[PDB]
Structure formats: structure tokens, C-alpha cells
Design a protein around this ligand. Structure first.
Ligand code: CLA
Ligand code: CLA
Ligand code: CLA
Ligand code: CLA
Ligand code: CLA
Ligand code: CLA
Ligand code: CLA
Ligand SMILES: CC1=C(/C=C/C(C)=C/C=C/C(C)=C/C=C/C=C(C)/C=C/C=C(C)/C=C/C2=C(C)CCCC2(C)C)C(C)(C)CCC1
Ligand SMILES: CC1=C(/C=C/C(C)=C/C=C\C(C)=C/C=C/C=C(C)/C=C/C=C(C)/C=C/C2=C(C)CCCC2(C)C)C(C)(C)CCC1
Ligand SMILES: CC1=C(/C=C/C(C)=C/C=C\C(C)=C\C=C\C=C(C)\C=C\C=C(C)\C=C\C2=C(C)CCCC2(C)C)C(C)(C)CCC1
Ligand SMILES: CCCCCCCCCCCCO[C@H]1O[C@H](CO)[C@@H](O[C@H]2O[C@H](CO)[C@@H](O)[C@H](O)[C@H]2O)[C@H](O)[C@H]1O
Ligand code: SF4
Ligand code: SF4
Lengths: 42, 154, 65, 81, 56, 138
């Protein structure tokens, strides 16, 4: 229903469903690794 | 190793921090949860900052006086990924913020009246020009400096 | 239509808002006579609420060409 | 100057364009060819204060006037009283 | 404004640049009108020259 | 005053208009026509009526007495007319002169619009050092 060469719109602040959430999933990485200050690698 | 002291393998001052400070976390002989199922200083908050024992990983990590750990990162003895490892990371992530900045933008100024399509958003995030960033191998590191954004357009 | 009337022109005066930028034109003057002919027009507004100005061929440096 | 703020433009046509401004501007002085043929930038300006209501409307395409007069009477500021 | 009415759309106004004083948000693009819109959003010199609604 | 009472533009009181500096220097005053008894708006905050006579209200300073237009022409009438009174006579015949309605053609009068050179590239700053022999007193 969405193929090739840009799509459908969206509101003024879907940024408030982008600050809240996405970014929100990141506390979700900041407790899985409840900590940082350098980091091991994969 | 360098200006401050040595890591965790020994750091006296650092040790004292572990202990007083946190463990006075204690400080509440009891405070009632003999069996009780809520008040969670008790379990972790300490232990999660704490079972962080004579281990924190081991990280090297220099630690000065008062034993709070300092970051050198000069690419030596041990400390390399306290800037570069999380540095290229900052670069890569940004730049694929604005590679697409210069994208769900350079895809509009055309067709028919295109004068604020941007207060609404055509493909949300761009969700089309999206991956162009991870789908940057090399990319702007050549095509930016040769063609398109070409000195012409400069 | 035969030569070029109003098909693409830069501005070069340095006072004019969209100066170095090239937008589109319209009914450029006919006669031998005056000194402020040529309407020009482009999308981008400017410091006034309404911006659709008239410059004049002593100049339009279009420039290459 | 003594009131010298340039609002001039090129059309100096004054229909659905600009009129506003306490006394100062008795123009319509048609110069021998400028479209709606009324031109220049002022009349006798030794009369009124310092607005920029002067543009706000109808082009000056450059600057637009403001206070610049310095030499400044009193009838030139409401308050000589 | 249409879109178009009076009387003779249910079809709601989602899409076509502007609304709020009449050489309105103009086709031609700008930012000021994005603090406009929120500010003076409630006001009454515009919406209609006629009491009526406003109290409604 | 009263022994000569010649009025026209009704009001009653007000701490608004005319005070000491309209004798000791200049004066300024507006006059007008009108149909039938109508209540107006006023400069200086107040508000009254009309009917006629000369319909000749006197006003502190001339920015004040043209505002009868900036509303007092959203209330019918060709004719409204302000002059300049002194403490003795004339020169400065204010709305007198020639024609009227700032947007017509009889003569040209003053104005000019140019300086020496026109709006063009005055990236050229201030020129000569101000010296009594080269046309910069205009
Ligand atoms: C997409 C984005 C974009 C890009 C590629 C740039 C790029 C640039 N900006 Mg910039 N900027 C932006 C948006 C952007 N900006 C926005 C929204 C603002 C707020 C008005 C600014 C305010 C700003 C200022 C004051 C300055 C710059 C400057 C610069 C230049 C220096 C980089 C820097 O250190 O600033 C870092 C970047 C910012 C501070 C911008 C924050 C906004 C970002 C996060 C936009 C993110 C994308 C956004 C959500 C778009 C939606 C995506 C869409 C496809 C769906 C660089 C050319 C500097 C300059 O002129 O020197 C050359 C100057 O200091 N910017
Ligand atoms: C009973 C009354 C109440 C009501 C119903 C109104 C209604 C109105 N007022 Mg009003 N007003 C009130 C009390 C009220 N006022 C009070 C107490 C004051 C004194 C401060 C004012 C001062 C005032 C002014 C100066 C103006 C109005 C205007 C208006 C009109 C515009 C409303 C609008 O668009 O929203 C405006 C609201 C916003 C744009 C939202 C922005 C709010 C910001 C500043 C946030 C506040 C800080 C807060 C801590 C931030 C949130 C937390 C954050 C840190 C996350 C509207 C008819 C305006 C007008 O033009 O009349 C037609 C005019 O601007 N009011
Ligand atoms: C009562 C209010 C509600 C609230 C709390 C907000 C709050 C906000 N709006 Mg907003 N808005 C609202 C109703 C509201 N709006 C409504 C009803 C409309 C009409 C659809 C809009 C149309 C609107 C637009 C066009 C914009 C905002 C924007 C904004 C943000 C500007 C500040 C900023 O830079 O943050 C960081 C702020 C989040 C601006 C924005 O920055 O969106 C990302 C701008 O886009 N709003
Ligand atoms: C993370 C830390 C530490 C460690 C364990 C390494 C490990 C290594 N580095 Mg390295 N490096 C470090 C810090 C470190 N470096 C620092 C601080 C710098 C800047 C001083 C560098 C500058 C550097 C260069 C220039 C190169 C390496 C290379 C390498 C090797 C290839 C790595 C790889 O997986 O390919 C990943 C590499 C790429 C995806 C492309 C590299 C871009 C050039 C490697 C085993 C490379 C190598 O040994 O030979 C080519 C390469 O020469 N490093
Ligand atoms: C290709 C390079 C990469 C880059 C971009 C740099 C860049 C730099 N190094 Mg460096 N370095 C690297 C790899 C790199 N290094 C590696 C692999 C080593 C291990 C031998 C070092 C050991 C090293 C030392 C000892 C120092 C630097 C220093 C420096 C800085 C001078 C400069 C910021 C110097 C510095 O920043 O301190 C004054 C100095 O301390 N580097
Ligand atoms: C995954 C990845 C991808 C594809 C994107 C993609 C994007 N990010 Mg983003 N971002 C990421 C990880 C990613 N981000 C991370 C890990 C962080 C932290 C952010 C913090 C961030 C911010 C603040 C913003 C974006 C924005 C954006 C958009 C520009 C674009 C869709 C912009 C929208 C906005 O500026 N990102
Ligand atoms: C060592 C260098 C120093 C120098 C000499 C320069 C020089 C320059 N930078 Mg620059 N820059 C520097 C450090 C420096 N930068 C740093 C530390 C940053 C951090 C981001 C930047 C970020 C930056 C950005 C984002 C941009 C520049 C741009 C430019 C160019 C200006 C455009 C121009 O004049 O057109 C000359 C050619 C024509 C007019 C045709 C110019 C070549 C602009 C550019 O992209 O250049 C390609 C661009 O805006 N710089
Ligand atoms: C965690 C981390 C990471 C991540 C990163 C990222 C990706 C990010 C981010 C974040 C971000 C990316 C942020 C940003 C933001 C932005 C901003 C915040 C902006 C702002 C703006 C401004 C502030 C402006 C202002 C102004 C203007 C507009 C102009 C002029 C005027 C003024 C000044 C007002 C990594 C891993 C990599 C590394 C490590 C750490
Ligand atoms: C090793 C090291 C170092 C070095 C440094 C140096 C030497 C620096 C300089 C630097 C520089 C000298 C820089 C500059 C460069 C140039 C340029 C020119 C850049 C750029 C750019 C651009 C152009 C970008 C763009 C973009 C992108 C890519 C993304 C998207 C879009 C945008 C726009 C954002 C340091 C210090 C860090 C420290 C330690 C480490
Ligand atoms: C209920 C309700 C309410 C309330 C509201 C509120 C109060 C809200 C708030 C909200 C909030 C209060 C929010 C906040 C947010 C914040 C956050 C979310 C934070 C964060 C973050 C992040 C995620 C980040 C991170 C990071 C890191 C890691 C480090 C640095 C960098 C960065 C920043 C990136 C009311 C009454 C109105 C009414 C209606 C309903
Ligand atoms: C009784 C005889 C009087 C009728 C006058 C003839 C005009 C007929 C249209 C109805 C009145 C006009 O508008 C009135 O009704 C509209 C629905 O129609 C309402 O709503 C709409 O109308 C407005 C214009 O008036 C629009 O600009 C508004 O954006 C819209 O919401 C308004 O809140 C109200 O002001
Ligand atoms: S309207 Fe403005 S000529 Fe036109 S800009 Fe000069 S006064 Fe009349
Ligand atoms: S801009 Fe100047 S001259 Fe014009 S009305 Fe205002 S004060 Fe008078």
C-alpha cells in the first residue's frame, strides 16, 4: 500500500511520539546495560 | 597508569568510596522489611551499584585522588575506547541524522506547489530515505566531494 | 518569442533581497524608453510580507548569459 | 536630513500601497515616466515626527526609514511640553 | 474559504496552506506563523466578525 | 472664555489637550463639516457631539488633529481642515495652500529623492572630511 518514491503524511508533533518512545527505547538500553562510561563490543 | 593512579586492580581511595558512601545506604539498621515485599534499597540500588564489587568489569580506568576515575584516551597502555569507540559511534549516528537531513529535504522543491509540505511530514522520519545512512558505505566520503553536491552547486 | 524575454535571471545589485539567486521573470519592457522595467518572481519571500519586485536590465548580470 | 530616511522605491504608485503617516508626505508629484507615474520620496518634511509607518507598507526595496534625523526639533518629538 | 460549502461539504478541511488573515500564510513559505497559530490561537478579531459563535 | 463665546465642537471637561506650551509657542487647530447631530470619538480621551457653526476645535499639536480622519474618515465627509495658529498671525499656512488630499497633481513643491548619488552601491562610505568647498550641504 506504500511502494516506491515517498509516502503519506503525519502531524505537527509526531515528534512527541518520537521523543517519547524511540529515544524512550534507550533507557531500555540504559538498563540492559544498566551502565556505561566506556563499553565492551560485539 | 598515567597522571592519576592505576585502575581497579588497586586504587585504595576508590575502595573507601565503594564502602562508605554507598554502604551507609545501610544506615537503617532495619526499616521494616523482615520478609516484606516492597522497599528495595535492600535488594540492588545498592547491589546494582554494589555487586559492582572489586569488579566493575575491570576497564583499566585511571582514578585520581578521591579515586573518581579519570578518562585519558590517548590510545595507549589500555585506554582507547573512551572516545574513539564511542566517538566514531557519535559520528556515524549523527551524519546519518543529517545525511537524511540533506535528504527528506533535497527530495522537495519541485512538482507542484511545494511551499510547507514540511509542517506535515511526507514519509514520517522520511521512511524511504531512511536507511540511506547504514546504506552509506563510503557515500558522502566521495559523492559529497565529487558530483551532486559538486563544486558547481558550491 | 524568438530571442529571450523572461526565462531565467539572476539579480546583481546588493540591496535586493534575492540578489545572487536566480528566480523567474515576466512581461519585461518593450520600448526604447525608461530605466526600471522587468518584473521578476520567485518562491522565497523576503523581509516584507509581499515580495515580487521590478529590477532593470542595466545589470541583470544574468551572467553567462 | 534634517529628516533623511529613504523609503524611495521605483513604482511610487500609491494605490493599495501606502498613505499612513502624520502630515509629512504630500507627494504624488508625477516624474515624466514611472508607470502609475507618481514618484520621489517626500514633500516638505519640516513638519512631523519620525515613524517608519513610512514604509511598513508600499516598498522602499533597500532600507525603509526610522529615526535617522539627529537634528531634532521638538514639534519633532511630541514633547516640547 | 471554501473548501467549499457552504452547504455541500461534510468533507473536512485537512490540506491547503493556511488560514488566519487574508493575504494569509500565503503559498510563499515562512516560520513566524508557527508561533502565530499557537499564540493568539484563541483571540476574536478573526473566526468571525460576529459574536454568536465565540460565546458558543 | 465667555463674553466672547463662539463655540462649535461640544465636549465638557478634560485633563487632555492644550496646556502652557501653545501660548508661549505655537498653536495648531482643526475645522470641519457634518450632517446631523452625531457623537464622536476624540483625541485626548473623552467624547462628545457636532451639529455645526464653524465646527472648529483647537488642538495642542498637529499629529493630534488629523486623527480626525484616521477614524473621522470612517464616518462620512469630504471636508476636514486644519491650519496653524500662532500667538500672532501666519507663515505656515497648514492645510490652506494648493489643492488637497495627499495623492493628486498640481505642483511638485519639495521632496526630490536622491541625495547626490542614488540608492546604488553606497558601499562607498562617507567621502570628503567635511570641508567648506564641496557640495555636501543638502
Ligand atoms: C537536518 C538538518 C540540519 C543540518 C544538516 C544542519 C547543519 C548545520 N547547521 Mg543547523 N540547524 C537545524 C537543522 C540542521 N542543521 C535546525 C532545525 C536548527 C534550529 C534553527 C539549526 C540551527 C543552527 C545554528 C544556530 C547553526 C547551525 C549550524 C549548522 C552547520 C554547523 C553544524 C552544527 O554544528 O550545528 C549542529 C546542528 C544543530 C544545532 C541543529 C539542530 C536540529 C537538528 C537536530 C535537525 C535534526 C533533523 C530534523 C528533526 C529534521 C527532520 C527529519 C525529516 C527528514 C523528517 C551545519 C551546516 C551553524 C552554522 O551556521 O555553521 C556552519 C550554526 O551555529 N544550525
Ligand atoms: C480567565 C482567563 C483566562 C482566559 C480564559 C484567557 C484567554 C485569553 N487570553 Mg489571557 N490572560 C490571563 C487569563 C486568561 N486568558 C491572565 C491571568 C493573564 C495575565 C498573565 C493573561 C494575559 C494575556 C495576554 C497578554 C494575552 C492574552 C490573550 C488571551 C486570548 C488568547 C489565548 C491563547 O491563544 O492562548 C495563549 C497560550 C499559549 C500560546 C500557550 C503558551 C503558554 C506558555 C507561556 C507556557 C507557560 C509557562 C509554563 C510554566 C510552561 C509549561 C511547562 C513547561 C516548562 C514544560 C484568550 C482569549 C492574548 C490576546 O491577544 O487576546 C486576544 C494576549 O496575548 N492573555
Ligand atoms: C495546547 C497545545 C498543544 C501543545 C502543548 C503544543 C505544543 C507544541 N507545539 Mg503545537 N499545535 C497544537 C496544540 C499544541 N501544541 C495544535 C492544536 C496545533 C494545530 C494542529 C498545533 C500546530 C503546531 C505546529 C505547526 C507546530 C507546533 C509546534 C509545537 C511545539 C513547539 C515548541 C518546540 O520547539 O518544542 C521542541 C510544542 C511541542 C511546532 C513544532 O515544533 O512541532 C515539532 C510546530 O510544528 N504545533
Ligand atoms: C578499539 C581499540 C584498540 C583496539 C583493540 C584496536 C584494534 C585494531 N585497530 Mg585500532 N586504533 C585505536 C585503538 C584500537 N584499535 C585507536 C585509539 C586508534 C587511533 C589512534 C586506532 C587507529 C587504527 C587504524 C588506522 C587502524 C587500526 C586498525 C586496528 C585493527 C583493525 C581493527 C578492525 O577490527 O577493523 C576495523 C577497521 C576498519 C573498519 C577500517 C579502518 C579505517 C582505516 C585492530 C585489530 C587497523 C589496522 O590494524 O590495519 C589496517 C587500521 O590500521 N586502528
Ligand atoms: C592513526 C591514528 C590515531 C589518531 C587519529 C591518533 C591521533 C592522535 N594521537 Mg595517537 N595513537 C594511535 C592511533 C591514533 N592517534 C595509536 C594506535 C597509538 C598507540 C601507539 C597512539 C599512541 C599515542 C600517544 C602516546 C599519543 C598520541 C597522541 C595523539 C594525538 C597527537 C592525536 C590526537 C598524543 C596525545 O594526544 O597526547 C599529547 C600522544 O599522547 N597517540
Ligand atoms: C537507528 C538510527 C536511525 C536509522 C536513526 C534515524 C533518524 N534519527 Mg536518530 N537516533 C539514534 C539511532 C537512529 N536514528 C540514536 C541511538 C539516538 C540517540 C538518536 C537521537 C536522535 C535525535 C535527537 C534525532 C534523531 C533523528 C533521526 C532522524 C533524522 C532519522 C530518522 C532526528 C529526528 C532527531 O534530531 N535521532
Ligand atoms: C581547517 C580548517 C578550517 C578552514 C580553513 C575551513 C574552511 C572552510 N570551511 Mg570549514 N570547518 C572547520 C575548519 C575549517 N574550515 C571545522 C573545524 C569545521 C567543523 C564542522 C568546519 C565545518 C564546516 C562546514 C559544515 C562547512 C564548512 C565549510 C568551509 C568552507 C567555506 C565555504 C566557502 O568559503 O566556499 C568556497 C567555495 C565557493 C564559494 C564556491 C571553507 C573552505 C562549508 C563547506 O562545506 O565547505 C566545502 C560548510 O559549511 N566547514
Ligand atoms: C548517547 C551517546 C551517543 C549518541 C549520540 C547521539 C546520536 C546523539 C545525540 C543527541 C543529539 C543529536 C542532540 C542534539 C540536539 C540538538 C539541539 C539541542 C539543537 C539546538 C538548537 C539550538 C540551541 C539553536 C538555537 C538558536 C538558533 C535556532 C539559531 C540562532 C539562535 C539560537 C541560539 C536561539 C553515542 C553512542 C553516539 C556516543 C556516546 C554517547
Ligand atoms: C585525531 C584527534 C583529533 C584531531 C583533530 C583535528 C586535527 C581536527 C580538525 C578537524 C577539522 C579540520 C575538521 C574539518 C573538516 C572539514 C570539513 C569541510 C568537514 C566537513 C564537512 C561537511 C561538509 C559535513 C557535511 C555533512 C555531513 C557529512 C552529514 C550530513 C550533512 C552535513 C552537512 C552535516 C582531535 C582534535 C579530535 C582530538 C583527538 C583525536
Ligand atoms: C497526567 C497529566 C498531566 C501531567 C503532565 C505531566 C507532568 C507530564 C510530564 C512529563 C514529563 C516530566 C516528561 C519527562 C520526560 C523526560 C525524559 C524522558 C528524560 C529523558 C531522557 C532520555 C531518554 C535521555 C537520555 C540521555 C542520556 C542517556 C544522557 C544524556 C543524553 C540523553 C538526553 C540522550 C497534566 C496535569 C498536565 C494534565 C494532563 C494529564
Ligand atoms: C439567519 C440568517 C443568517 C444567516 C447568514 C447567511 C450565511 C450562512 C452561513 C451560516 C453563518 C456563517 O457562519 C456561521 O456558521 C458556520 C457554519 O455555517 C460556523 O462555522 C463555519 O463558518 C465560518 C464563517 O461564518 C467559517 O469561517 C468557519 O471557519 C466555520 O467553522 C460559524 O461558527 C458561524 O459564524
Ligand atoms: S508606495 Fe511607497 S512610491 Fe511606492 S514605495 Fe514609494 S511611497 Fe509610494
Ligand atoms: S515616516 Fe517619517 S515622514 Fe513618514 S510619516 Fe512617518 S514620520 Fe512622517
Amino acid at each position: 500500500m506504500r511502494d516506491f518514491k515517498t509516502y503519506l503524511s503525519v502531524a505537527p508533533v509526531l515528534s512527541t511520539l518520537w521523543f517519547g518512545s524511540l529515544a524512550g527505547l534507550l533507557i531500555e538500553i540504559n538498563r540492559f546495560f544498566p551502565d556505561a562510561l566506556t563499553f565492551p563490543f560485539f | 597508569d598515567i597522571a592519576g593512579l592505576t585502575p581497579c586492580k588497586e586504587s585504595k581511595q576508590f575502595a573507601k568510596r565503594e564502602k562508605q558512601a554507598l554502604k551507609k545506604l545501610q544506615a537503617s539498621l532495619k526499616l521494616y522489611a523482615d520478609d516484606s515485599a516492597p522497599a528495595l534499597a535492600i535488594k540492588a540500588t545498592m547491589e546494582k551499584t554494589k555487586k559492582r564489587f572489586d569488579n566493575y568489569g575491570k576497564y583499566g580506568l585511571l582514578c585520581g585522588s578521591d579515586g573518581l576515575p579519570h578518562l585519558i584516551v590517548s590510545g595507549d597502555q589500555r585506554h582507547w575506547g573512551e572516545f574513539i569507540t564511542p566517538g566514531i559511534l557519535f559520528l556515524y549516528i549523527a551524519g546519518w541524522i543529517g545525511w537524511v537531513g540533506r535528504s527528506y529535504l533535497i527530495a522537495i522543491r519541485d512538482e507542484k506547489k511545494p511551499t510547507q509540505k514540511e509542517i506535515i511530514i511526507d514519509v514520517p522520519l522520511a521512511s524511504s530515505l531512511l536507511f540511506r545512512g547504514f546504506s552509506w558505505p563510503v557515500a558522502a566520503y566521495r559523492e559529497l566531494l565529487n558530483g551532486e553536491l559538486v563544486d558547481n552547486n558550491f | 518569442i524568438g530571442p529571450k524575454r523572461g526565462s531565467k535571471v539572476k539579480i546583481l545589485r546588493r540591496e535586493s533581497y534575492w540578489f545572487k539567486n536566480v528566480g523567474s521573470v515576466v512581461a519585461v519592457d518593450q520600448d526604447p524608453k525608461t530605466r526600471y522595467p522587468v518584473v521578476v518572481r520567485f518562491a522565497k519571500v523576503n523581509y516584507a510580507n509581499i515580495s515580487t519586485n521590478n529590477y532593470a536590465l542595466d545589470e541583470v548580470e544574468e551572467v553567462a548569459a | 536630513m534634517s529628516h533623511s530616511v529613504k523609503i524611495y522605491d521605483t513604482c511610487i504608485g500609491c494605490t493599495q500601497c501606502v498613505r499612513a503617516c502624520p502630515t509629512d508626505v504630500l507627494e504624488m508629484i508625477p516624474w515624466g515616466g514611472c508607470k502609475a507615474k507618481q514618484i520621489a520620496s517626500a514633500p516638505r518634511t519640516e513638519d512631523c515626527v519620525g515613524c517608519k509607518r513610512c514604509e511598513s507598507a508600499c516598498p522602499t526595496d533597500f532600507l525603509s526609514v526610522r529615526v535617522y534625523l539627529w537634528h531634532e526639533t521638538t514639534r519633532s518629538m511630541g514633547l516640547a511640553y | 474559504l471554501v473548501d467549499r460549502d457552504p452547504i455541500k461539504t461534510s468533507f473536512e478541511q485537512w490540506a491547503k496552506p493556511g488560514h488566519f488573515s487574508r493575504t494569509i500564510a500565503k503559498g510563499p513559505d515562512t516560520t513566524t506563523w508557527i508561533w502565530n497559530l499557537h499564540a493568539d490561537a484563541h483571540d476574536f478579531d478573526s473566526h468571525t466578525s460576529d459574536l454568536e459563535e465565540i460565546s458558543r | 472664555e465667555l463674553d466672547p463665546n463662539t463655540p462649535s465642537p461640544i465636549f465638557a471637561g478634560s485633563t487632555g489637550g492644550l496646556l502652557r506650551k501653545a501660548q508661549v509657542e505655537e498653536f495648531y487647530v482643526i475645522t470641519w463639516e457634518s450632517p446631523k447631530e452625531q457623537i464622536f470619538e476624540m483625541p485626548t480621551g473623552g467624547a462628545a457631539i457636532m451639529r455645526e457653526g464653524p465646527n472648529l476645535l483647537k488642538l495642542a499639536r498637529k499629529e493630534q488633529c488629523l486623527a480626525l480622519g484616521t477614524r473621522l474618515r470612517s464616518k462620512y465627509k469630504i471636508k476636514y481642515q486644519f491650519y496653524r495658529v500662532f500667538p500672532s498671525g501666519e507663515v505656515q499656512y497648514l492645510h490652506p495652500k494648493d489643492g488637497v488630499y495627499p495623492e493628486k497633481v498640481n505642483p511638485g513643491r519639495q521632496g526630490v529623492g536622491l541625495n547626490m548619488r542614488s540608492i546604488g552601491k553606497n558601499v562607498s562610505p562617507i567621502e570628503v572630511k567635511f570641508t567648506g568647498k564641496q557640495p555636501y550641504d543638502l
